[PDB]
Structure 1
Amino acid sequence: ASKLRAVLEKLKLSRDDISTAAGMVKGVVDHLLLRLKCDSAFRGVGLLNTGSYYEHVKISAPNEFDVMFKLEVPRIQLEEYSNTRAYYFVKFHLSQFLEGEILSASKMLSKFRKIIKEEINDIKDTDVIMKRKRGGSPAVTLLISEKISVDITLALESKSSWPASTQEGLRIQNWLSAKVRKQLRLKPFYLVPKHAKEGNGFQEETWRLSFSHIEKEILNNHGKSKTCCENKEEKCCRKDCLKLMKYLLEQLKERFKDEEHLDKFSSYHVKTAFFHVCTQNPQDSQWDRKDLGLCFDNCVTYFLQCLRTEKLENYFIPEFNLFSSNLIDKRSKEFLTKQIEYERNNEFPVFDEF
């Protein structure tokens, strides 16, 4: 009926596209998993599916999938890197990766990337290529059949207690319950080969904490009520609001692709801000389908406040500020503030098709 509901209709994924893309991705991922198990270093890899497709908040087309290839490293000892809260040294067939007693993130990622590159070349039945290494990413990115991108992130799995920098994160007690928080923090955590900033460069030995699996569990079990979105009387608009925030940023980045001020914004910024708004608004009655426009406004104004105050804490690691001036210039946040305010004040013309 409404403008926003019409936008959501256009953002829905086609069942046929899903069927084709799911089969294509599974074939390639399962192949690489099998072949990586042949290498002595990656003998123990397992699959975890992550990101927006597996949280059912992928929009427009199923053409971008995220997966972790995780390895359990028992007796893992961590050392936080230079008070960064999110980046760590890992102290420790893995010997090829040691730089001292440090298990080098870049060394492992390099070898991981090299094995995958050699293995996709032998896939003659399918058209699979490696995309160029994108700086700062822990992923190795594939393109299947010129159309579907798959980001494969190497991860070390730890079944130890989560690091102390997470003690005050995951503030879900009033929304999803204290007992759920306790259950989630008994799950493993992951380290991925995303390196801390060091000057104008990177500390290439360091790893980054990742809780992508907890983000998926929260998105796929997202209500105060256990039956949220399982029946026609409890269809909340939380996922719709995240889809609309993602589309707002996707559209602005496309329009402003030649404007440097939008380069460092990402869908993870809107995902993080969305989790915070869920913490702020914990009741399912604050996400009623009939209030879609108000709920989406709640999300837009929260994100605008994050930009203006330069505060967007990582949801798991509260002293890691994604909107720190060390990461994004004030001028760039003000620029995005300007464009989002324009959309809010004009009923989101960037959502119009014509």
Structure 2
Amino acid sequence: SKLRAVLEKLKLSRDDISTAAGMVKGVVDHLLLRLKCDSAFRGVGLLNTGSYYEHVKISAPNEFDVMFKLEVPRIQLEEYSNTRAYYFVKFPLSQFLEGEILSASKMLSKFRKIIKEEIDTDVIMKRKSPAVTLLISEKISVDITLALESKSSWPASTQEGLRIQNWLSAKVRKQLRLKPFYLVPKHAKEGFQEETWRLSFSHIEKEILNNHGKSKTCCENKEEKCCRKDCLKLMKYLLEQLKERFKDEKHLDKFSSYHVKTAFFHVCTQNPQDSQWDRKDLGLCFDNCVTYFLQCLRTEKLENYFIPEFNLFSSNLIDKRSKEFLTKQIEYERNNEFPVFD
């Protein structure tokens, strides 16, 4: 009942939803119209992503993630430095070519420049993530991310990813792998290799979260109201609260809600049946998520759900001392019934 009461507090107000949805639409629509006038961005289209469009945004609808996707035919990818997730792209995009290489930084710079010049709305741009980040009315943040869309087969680094066959089905895995993949202008470390792009499957994360049960009717009727999204919301709030309490501790700076989202997908793979997420077992299901995440921190292993050889918890990305620090705080919370929720 304590956790149910937490979830009630995390619910988004209907009035805040209605107001925020309109504020975002006015800004997104204006920017799309302007970008389409530029020869380079003429084919841009909207793809809504992230927690709001997955219905796992908590507390307030004050942060929205959108991709401005651009179909680019006939791309050839070259993996950068065995990073598994970062690539060079080769083939009105000639202005962005360095030789045969399509520069992520040059395309992002023009995209940001156009947005900056274009912004009944108070809109400011936050300093230069692949996103151009806007703040509407001092309240609503919007991450606008240029994304190249490729309709080709997914890169080889994904061959063993997306291990959903025992949960969502092999047929679904095959359908999802026929969808496009995206490249966003987030550069690999080098200093950054400023031509490099990063693979993204944010659209598939949304597809899974909004169609998340083994039963096709999961969450469509009162007898099948599972606790999967509630558990992700509680894990997100646990991490948010810890990061806020420890905001002056560097140890928590590199953790993000994507770490809990990725751990959560792995728990769904481990626990594929809807009866393992029954509403009446909320506390146990949340505990399964917390203990799984603790195991990831201890073993220093959290594979990207789509790119298994990309380890989000590698010491190259997050120091061992930082993972041990977060382990200590989560263990204290688990051992004391989550006082950070009170």
TM-score band, normalised by shorter chain:
over 0.9
* Helix, strand or coil at the partner of 1:53: helix
* Helix, strand or coil at the partner of 1:151: strand
- Residue 96 of structure 1: CA displacement? 1.4
- Residue 92 of structure 1: CA displacement? 2.3
C-alpha distance in 1 between matches for 2:186 and 2:285 = 34
* Helix, strand or coil at the partner of 1:84: coil
- Residue 152 of structure 1: CA displacement? 0.3
Cross-structure match for 1:92: 91
- Residue 84 of structure 1: CA displacement? 0.7
The reply on whether 1:177 has 2:172 as its aligned counterpart is no
C-alpha distance in 1 between matches for 2:137 and 2:252 = 29
C-alpha distance in 2 between matches for 1:314 and 1:260 = 23
* Helix, strand or coil at the partner of 2:224: coil
C-alpha distance in 2 between matches for 1:100 and 1:302 = 46
Deviations 1:141-162 (A, max 9, x none): 0011111000000000000000
- Residue 93 of structure 1: CA displacement? 1.7
C-alpha distance in 2 between matches for 1:275 and 1:165 = 18
| Alignment counterpart, residue 271 of structure 1, candidates 255, 261, 269 | 261
- Residue 126 of structure 1: CA displacement? 1.3
Deviations 1:60-91 (A, max 9, x none): 00000000000000011100111111000001
C-alpha distance in 1 between matches for 2:314 and 2:194 = 21
C-alpha distance in 2 between matches for 1:94 and 1:279 = 40
C-alpha distance in 1 between matches for 2:187 and 2:263 = 23
C-alpha distance in 1 between matches for 2:44 and 2:332 = 47
- Residue 131 of structure 1: CA displacement? 1.0
| Alignment counterpart, residue 142 of structure 1, candidates 134, 155, 160 | 134
* Helix, strand or coil at the partner of 1:74: coil
C-alpha distance in 2 between matches for 1:287 and 1:334 = 29
RMSD between aligned residues: 0.5
| Alignment counterpart, residue 314 of structure 1, candidates 304, 316, 340 | 304
* Helix, strand or coil at the partner of 1:343: helix
C-alpha distance in 1 between matches for 2:330 and 2:244 = 14
C-alpha distance in 1 between matches for 2:82 and 2:62 = 37
C-alpha distance in 2 between matches for 1:25 and 1:45 = 17
C-alpha distance in 2 between matches for 1:194 and 1:131 = 16
- Residue 327 of structure 1: CA displacement? 0.3
Deviations 1:92-119 (A, max 9, x none): 2211111111001011111110000001
In the TM superposition, structure 1's runs of 4+ consecutive aligned residues that sit over 3 Å from their partners are none
C-alpha distance in 2 between matches for 1:195 and 1:323 = 18
Deviations 1:225-268 (A, max 9, x none): 00000000000000000000000000000000000000000000
C-alpha distance in 2 between matches for 1:126 and 1:13 = 22
Deviations 1:123-176 (A, max 9, x none): xx211111111xxx0000001111100000000000000000000000000000
Structure 1 range deviating more: 92-101 or 240-249: 92-101
C-alpha distance in 1 between matches for 2:138 and 2:212 = 34
The reply on whether 1:126 has 2:118 as its aligned counterpart is no
| Uncovered stretches (5+) of structure 1, i.e. residues with no partner | 120-124
TM-score normalised according to structure 1 size:
0.96
Deviations 1:183-237 (A, max 9, x none): 0000000000011111xx1111100000000000000000000000000000000
- Residue 31 of structure 1: CA displacement? 0.8
* Helix, strand or coil at the partner of 1:294: helix
C-alpha distance in 1 between matches for 2:145 and 2:78 = 21
C-alpha distance in 2 between matches for 1:308 and 1:143 = 37
C-alpha distance in 2 between matches for 1:342 and 1:132 = 36
C-alpha distance in 2 between matches for 1:202 and 1:324 = 19
* Helix, strand or coil at the partner of 1:25: helix
C-alpha distance in 2 between matches for 1:339 and 1:51 = 26
* Helix, strand or coil at the partner of 2:127: coil
C-alpha distance in 2 between matches for 1:28 and 1:82 = 38
Cross-structure match for 2:220: 230
* Helix, strand or coil at the partner of 2:9: helix
| Uncovered stretches (5+) of structure 2, i.e. residues with no partner | none
C-alpha distance in 2 between matches for 1:177 and 1:92 = 34
* Helix, strand or coil at the partner of 2:138: coil
C-alpha distance in 2 between matches for 1:159 and 1:204 = 24
Between the aligned residues of both structures, percent identity stands at: 99
C-alpha distance in 1 between matches for 2:90 and 2:177 = 22
* Helix, strand or coil at the partner of 1:323: coil
C-alpha distance in 1 between matches for 2:121 and 2:288 = 45
C-alpha distance in 1 between matches for 2:318 and 2:82 = 19
* Helix, strand or coil at the partner of 2:46: strand
- Residue 277 of structure 1: CA displacement? 0.2
C-alpha distance in 1 between matches for 2:313 and 2:99 = 34
C-alpha distance in 2 between matches for 1:336 and 1:129 = 34
Deviations 1:278-306 (A, max 9, x none): 00000000000000000000000000000
TM-score normalised according to structure 2 size:
0.99
